[PDB]
């Protein structure tokens, strides 16, 4: 008998768990590896040399090997001879899916663990339980690799601009790839962070485009008063940067949008990626609500609907505004034409 009862429970249990064990394990292995610096050396097209990577990362090589042997058992890498490991063929998709888990469970963990304090004294909780910006940045890039970054890339590229401006450039990755794909164009990577700009500047020298790529280390709010760098841009790009100005700096935000419209060359457009609040459709609703609740309740940053965004961009002077659904749940791309 016992063989048969355990047989149905096994089948029923397999169905109930579904893909969650796999994703749970992938997310933990990949966050742990990324914190160690290992994940950046894993790629499906080349091998990681443990002897060299352990020295680059200042890890004891036996400890690094035990880690890679665990993720090899997990099936996320392939051992290609002693001391060499290569990521599994679909590694980048697995890493992308882990970005969602890392964002809600790791980047936003202070909100998960301390919700009571936020409900009691939001001001004290907001400056006591703060997010790790490196985890926010990495999980966002993982989520963006397949869910919003390619749409922006292909859109800017297709317009074939000659002057691109990226508000909140950070890594400057978007600029390097639009310059390397459209000939003769130039780019400007505005970003306030010192940390994001030294690492960006050297990668500008890496590609060898320092003549075409300016990096100014100012805030995006500085555009409201000093919109000089924008002059003549064919595409101005803004990825998930505007909602941090709302609702506290709405006037500055509306001024930056109006300066953006004024400063575009004819036929140019402003391409904004951002998150709309609490969608209802079955695909997007669950992650939408997580993005919306984290922002509304814990960060008190205003997410705007498509209607609000369209009205705000048309009040900034833009003739026509197109909204494009992104694969990233609750993410929208707004193309605001001059």
Ligand X SMILES: CC(C)CC(=O)C(=O)O
Q: Which of residues 88-117 bind a copy of itself (CB under 8 A)?
A: 93, 96-101, 103-106, 108-109, 111-113, 115-116
Question: How many C-beta atoms surround the C-beta of residue 316 within 10 A?
Answer: 20
> Is residue 75 involved in binding Mg ion (CB under 5 A)?
no
Q: Find out whether 333 and 148 touch, Cβ atoms under 8 Å.
A: yes
Query: Of these, 278, 299, 301, 317, which contacts a copy of itself (CB under 8 A)?
Result: 278
Encode burial over 135-162: b for 16+ CB neighbours within 10 A, e otherwise. Answer: bebbbbbbbbebbbbebbbebbbebebe
> Is residue 233 involved in binding a copy of itself (CB under 8 A)?
no
Encode burial over 225-256: b for 16+ CB neighbours within 10 A, e otherwise. Answer: eebebbeebbbbbbbbbbbbbbeeeeebbbbb
The answer to whether 145 is a known ligand-binding residue is no
State which of positions 39-98 bind a copy of itself (CB under 8 A).
59-60, 63, 66-67, 70-71, 73-76, 93, 96-98
To a copy of itself, the closest distance from the beta carbon of 221 in angstroms equals 29
Tokens found for residue 205:
């020298």
Residue 193 partner contact from ligand X, Mg ion, a copy of itself, none using kind-dependent CB cut-offs of 5 to 8 Å: none
Query: Of these, 14, 55, 56, 154, which contacts Mg ion (CB under 5 A)?
Result: 14
Residue 136 partner contact from ligand X, Mg ion, a copy of itself, none using kind-dependent CB cut-offs of 5 to 8 Å: ligand X
> For residue 278, which of 298, 297, 303, 301 has the smallest C-alpha distance?
303
To ligand X, the closest distance from the beta carbon of 89 in angstroms equals 27
Using the structure block, give the residue that is written with the tokens 């400063």. 263
Q: How far is CA 12 from the centre of its chain?
A: 37
Residue 333 partner contact from ligand X, a copy of itself, Mg ion, none using kind-dependent CB cut-offs of 5 to 8 Å: a copy of itself
Binding residues for Zn(2+): 243-244, 295
């Amino acid at each position: 008998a016992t063989h048969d009862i355990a047989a149905q429970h096994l089948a029923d249990g397999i169905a109930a768990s579904g893909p969650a064990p796999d994703l749970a394990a992938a997310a933990a292995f990949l966050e742990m590896g990324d914190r160690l610096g290992v994940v950046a050396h894993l790629d499906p097209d080349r091998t990681l040399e443990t002897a060299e990577v352990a020295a680059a990362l200042d890890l004891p090589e036996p400890a690094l090997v035990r880690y890679l042997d665990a993720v090899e058992s997990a099936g996320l890498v392939i051992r290609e001879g002693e001391g060499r490991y290569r990521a599994c063929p679909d590694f980048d998709t697995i890493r992308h899916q882990a970005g969602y888990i890392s964002w809600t469970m790791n980047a936003n963990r202070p909100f998960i663990e301390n919700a009571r304090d936020f409900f009691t004294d939001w001001d004290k909780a907001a400056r006591t339980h703060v997010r790790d910006y490196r985890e926010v940045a990495v999980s966002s890039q993982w989520m963006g690799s397949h869910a919003f970054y390619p749409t922006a890339l292909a859109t800017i590229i297709d317009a074939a601009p000659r002057k691109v401006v990226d508000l909140g450039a950070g890594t400057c990755r978007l600029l390097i790839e639009v310059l390397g794909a459209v000939p003769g164009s130039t780019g400007v990577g505005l970003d306030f962070a010192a940390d994001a700009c030294r690492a960006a500047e050297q990668a500008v020298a890496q590609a060898g485009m320092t003549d075409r790529l300016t990096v100014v280390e100012r805030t995006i709010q500085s555009v409201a008063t000093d919109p000089g760098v924008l002059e003549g841009a064919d595409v101005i790009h803004a990825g998930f940067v505007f909602h941090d100005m709302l609702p506290e700096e709405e006037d500055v935000c509306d001024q930056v949008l109006a300066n953006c419209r004024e400063s575009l060359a004819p036929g140019g457009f402003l391409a904004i990626t951002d998150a709309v609040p609490y969608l209802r459709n079955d695909r997007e609703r669950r992650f939408s609500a997580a993005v919306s609740y984290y922002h509304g309740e814990f960060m008190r940053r205003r997410l705007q609907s498509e209607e609000e965004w369209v009205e705000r961009l048309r009040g900034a002077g833009f003739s026509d505004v197109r909204a494009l659904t992104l694969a990233f749940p609750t993410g929208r791309l707004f193309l605001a034409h001059r």
